[PDB]
RNA sequence: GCUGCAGUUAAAAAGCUCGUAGUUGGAUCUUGUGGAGGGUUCCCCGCCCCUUGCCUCUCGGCGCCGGCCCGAAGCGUUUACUUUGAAAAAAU
């Protein structure tokens, strides 16, 4: 009965983007989705989104380029120590040149390039590939 | 595609769907590749230059070329809108 | 009064004041008396817009505010005849309480209650400035920066009521909080 | 194509009104539903003609951009297309090919009548399955003429119009040969054309 | 369906035939009206999936009447929705 | 879906976006007060005097035009029943069951469905206990269940 | 087969539903600038109400010319998580 939201919804927009569409409806979202399509965003794997209010728990409409692959969850949110993050990148990642982890940590939700700048691990997400 | 000195290593550059953005692999004989003139806009004659278009080939056999063109079309001088 | 009608305010303020007399010399005169009641301001202040001009703007004492609404049409019709150029908008002074997880000393002293919150002040605020009219929707753009637009959708009712003041609006917003809001009209009501 | 030179003149509109190009089917697809405007109340489809001539004009500058115009081959299969054919063969120099087709025209080398084209003009999608599915196999643009139930699948530029069998057929083969020789240049706009549309319609039991 | 139907400006005529739980803001298909009786005459306002009946505070001895869906006036003149 | 039926639809009902009171309704924040203090003397349960403002009056949603929600009200003058609605209006059910039950003793569809009622009095029990809403101790035994309707 | 299998027909979903432990659980409660390291906003200080959150002291050092100013004592509602330190026999 909807245990997880950010698995529809990460279903939801690659679900559609094999399809060849160009605009995707997401319903419920929160903080954590929001926090994870800006980090799609940065790099340029989708266009920019809007989220609608309507006094529950709102829906996003995403803009969707082609350049989005694949995009998933991890469903229990394990811990990652930053001596465990490279046996992840390398059994979830296709290769070591581009993609990116996902993880929130006490710094942020953030992509593992950056907690490694930043020197610290905590509970990982998902992936973009 | 380059290294770290920069020149280019790569046995070419397939193009890309103008309606789906997805590269346009060298056994796909459904891809086609629209040429669509351009006329003098004084006197309604072709002049010369025209537009092209690529078009994938799973857009094609899902019945979506047609309306992909279309608003390839309207992107640009050939309709300005008011369809 | 003119002086002793500005409490928890650090009380000569001279804009403040001027205004203060004012307002209350109109509630003076039994002209207009019987929809004013003689009742407390807390502060002003006035400031730039984007479009060259300038605007003031009043902070009411929250329970009072329910009933300057019952009259706030005309009266701000009397105070721009009065302060010919300047807009008036009404706010209430509404209070903020620091997240208490850790953003103040936690000390189980209440709850914080959540009308005390952040963005329910921040959403507050922003229907308060257009009173005549009603939102209607809201949406946000994410745009590729991570910057933010809000859109606003007001009723097409009261559109000659507010229409003119869509621009002010914007400015004083992006002064109280920061953030970049842009008032549309809906084509359709359903 | 957007400017007044190109713009629809009514007399056109009398020629489309008096073949009765308007007039669709009873059924309808999810695809061609743009191109509808709205459903008499006998239960029929009408064609918004305004999208008609937009898309007449986007085949027109498809065909003109082919530099030898002897690989812009046309194709009909029922009878109500082959006599229009033919006289588009007679306008500009294409290729007709009006009855059956024989399978494997384009995609076999050792065929007699294997011919290579660049462009493939067809009436009526449904009863041309079969050039179609072979356009399918040797990168080739198409342009079709629907209808309000003709399944879009392998055509790229759509021309809604009757074609259900009619003088539609022969004035929509008649306006786009019109087209594609006025702005390729070899007949001057605004001078009515000395052929008649009538050289383009079908034999029905003659005398 | 085109493959690129966008969805932040629906149709004013389409987003109000889908049901009203699956459009963009939800929104009911209620309304609220001012029937006014024959006879005694006050300006009674009404609920329209009404499911009681009503009475005109008066000279009436029913004024709607409970069904499956909306109610049914037996006489009520005006019911203008009031549109607030 | 459902939780002891298989069918699933969705008949909910769907509030205005505009939550502000309706700009032409006569009746005010402090007349709505005495309007369900008195419809409650009569014995009204909090739906039922819902749907009476809601169809013979113009009060929409009574927690829009007031602050506070129907029961609230009948809690803060003491007139909200000893136990909800909600598990009343269950007990009522199951005790009009074990009579049919009693009376014919092959009805084994009733006694089937008198199983699933009884199963979600228990599922209700057991969440209004840890609320603080029932004394802990509490129970449903038939012929005592009886007497609890009361 | 945790990473990582399978259950229409190949081996296999209890005849059917209810139900305590167990396992899993919807949305929601604070943001911009002046300097610093890194660029052209954004990521050690304080500013819109807050910024280690305060208190009030007292005994002892740090200042000025007694009087007044700031470091320490209380800890911030608790955990899990993450990072750093301490402490961990040798041989392998
Ligand atoms: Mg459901
Ligand atoms: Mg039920
Ligand atoms: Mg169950
Ligand atoms: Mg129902
Ligand atoms: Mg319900
Ligand atoms: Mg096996
Ligand atoms: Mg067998
Ligand atoms: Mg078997
Ligand atoms: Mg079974
Ligand atoms: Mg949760």
New interface residues.
């Given amino acids: 009965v909807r245990m997880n939201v950010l698995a529809d919804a990460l279903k939801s927009i690659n679900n559609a983007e094999k399809?060849?569409?160009?605009?995707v409806?997401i319903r419920p979202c929160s903080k954590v989705i929001?926090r994870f399509?800006?980090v799609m965003?940065?790099h340029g794997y989708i266009?920019?989104?809007?989220?609608?209010?309507?006094?529950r728990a709102g829906?996003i409409?995403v803009n969707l380029?082609?350049?989005l692959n694949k995009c998933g969850v991890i469903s229990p949110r394990f811990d990652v120590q930053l001596k465990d993050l490279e046996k992840w990148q390398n059994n979830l990642l296709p290769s070591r040149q581009f993609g990116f982890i996902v993880l929130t940590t006490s710094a942020g939700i953030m992509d593992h390039e950056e907690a490694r700048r930043k020197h610290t691990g905590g509970k990982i997400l998902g992936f973009f590939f | 595609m380059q290294n770290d000195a920069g020149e280019f290593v790569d046995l070419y550059v397939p193009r890309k769907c103008s309606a789906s953005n997805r590269i346009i692999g060298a056994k796909d004989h459904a891809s086609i590749q629209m040429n669509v003139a351009e006329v003098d806009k004084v006197t309604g004659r072709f002049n010369g230059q025209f537009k092209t278009y690529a078009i994938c080939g799973a857009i094609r056999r899902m019945g979506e070329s047609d309306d992909s063109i279309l608003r390839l079309a309207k992107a640009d001088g050939i309709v300005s809108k008011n369809f | 009064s003119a002086k002793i009608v500005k409490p928890n305010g650090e009380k000569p303020d001279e804009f403040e004041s001027g205004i203060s007399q004012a307002l209350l010399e109109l509630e003076m005169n039994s002209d207009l008396k019987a929809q004013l009641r003689e009742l407390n301001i807390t502060a002003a202040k006035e400031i730039e817009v984007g479009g060259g001009r300038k605007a003031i703007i009043i902070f009411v004492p929250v329970p009072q505010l329910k009933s300057f609404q019952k009259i706030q049409v005309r009266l701000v019709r009397e105070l721009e005849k009065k302060f010919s150029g300047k807009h008036v908008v009404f706010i209430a002074q509404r209070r903020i309480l620091p997240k208490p997880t850790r953003k103040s000393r936690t000390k189980n002293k209440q709850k914080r209650p959540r009308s005390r919150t952040l963005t329910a002040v921040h959403d507050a605020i922003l229907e308060d400035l257009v009173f005549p009219s009603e939102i209607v929707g809201k949406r946000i753009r994410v745009k590729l920066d991570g910057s933010r637009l809000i859109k606003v959708h007001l009723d097409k009712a009261q559109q000659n009521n507010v229409e003119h003041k869509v621009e002010t609006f914007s400015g004083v917003y992006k002064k109280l909080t920061g953030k970049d809001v842009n008032f549309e009209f809906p084509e359709f009501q359903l | 194509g957007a400017l007044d030179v190109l713009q629809m003149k009514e007399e056109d509109v009398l020629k489309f009104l008096a073949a009765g190009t308007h007039l669709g089917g009873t059924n309808l697809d999810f695809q061609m539903e743009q191109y509808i405007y709205k459903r008499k109340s006998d239960g029929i489809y009408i064609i918004n003609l305004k999208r008609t001539w937009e898309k007449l004009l986007l085949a027109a500058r498809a065909i003109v951009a082919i530099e030898n115009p002897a690989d812009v081959s046309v194709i009909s299969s029922r009878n109500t297309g082959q006599r229009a054919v033919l006289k588009f063969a007679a306008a500009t120099g294409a290729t007709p090919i009006a009855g059956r087709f024989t399978p494997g025209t384009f995609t076999n080398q050792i065929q007699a009548a294997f011919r290579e084209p660049r462009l493939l003009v067809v009436t009526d999608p449904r009863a041309d399955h079969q050039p179609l599915t072979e356009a399918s196999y040797v990168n080739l643009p198409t342009i079709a003429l629907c209808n309000t139930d003709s399944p879009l699948r392998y055509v790229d530029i759509a021309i809604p119009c009757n074609n259900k069998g009619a003088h539609s057929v022969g004035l929509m083969w008649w306006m786009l040969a019109r087209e594609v020789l006025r702005m390729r240049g070899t007949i001057s706009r605004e001078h009515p054309w000395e052929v008649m549309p009538d050289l383009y319609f079908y034999r029905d039991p003659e005398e | 369906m085109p493959l690129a139907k966008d969805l932040l400006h629906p149709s004013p005529e389409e987003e109000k035939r889908k049901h009203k739980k699956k459009r963009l803001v939800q929104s009911p298909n209620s309304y609220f009206m001012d029937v006014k009786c024959p006879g005694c005459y006050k300006i009674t306002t009404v609920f329209s999936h009404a499911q009681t009946v009503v009475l005109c505070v008066g000279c009436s001895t029913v004024l709607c009447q409970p069904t499956g869906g909306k109610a049914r006036l037996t006489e009520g003149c005006s019911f203008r929705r009031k549109q607030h | 879906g459902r939780m002891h039926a298989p069918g699933k639809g969705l008949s909910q009902s769907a509030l205005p976006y505009r939550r502000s009171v309706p700009t032409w309704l006569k009746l005010t924040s402090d007349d709505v007060k005495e309007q369900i203090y008195k419809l409650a003397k009569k014995g009204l349960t909090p739906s039922q005097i819902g749907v009476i403002l809601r169809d013979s009056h113009g009060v929409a949603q009574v927690r829009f035009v007031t602050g506070n929600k129907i029961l609230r009200i009948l809690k803060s003058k003491g007139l909200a029943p000893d136990l909800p609605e909600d598990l009343y209006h269950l007990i009522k059910k199951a005790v009009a069951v074990r009579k049919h039950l009693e009376r014919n003793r092959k009805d084994k569809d009733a006694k089937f469905r008198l199983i699933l009622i009884e199963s979600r009095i228990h599922r209700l029990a057991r969440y209004y206990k840890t609320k603080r809403v029932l004394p802990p101790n509490w129970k449903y035994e038939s012929s005592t269940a009886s007497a609890l309707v009361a």
Avoid: A, C, S, W
């Fill in positions: 399809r060849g569409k160009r605009q409806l929001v399509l800006t965003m940065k266009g920019e989104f809007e989220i609608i209010d309507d006094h829906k409409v380029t082609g350049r």
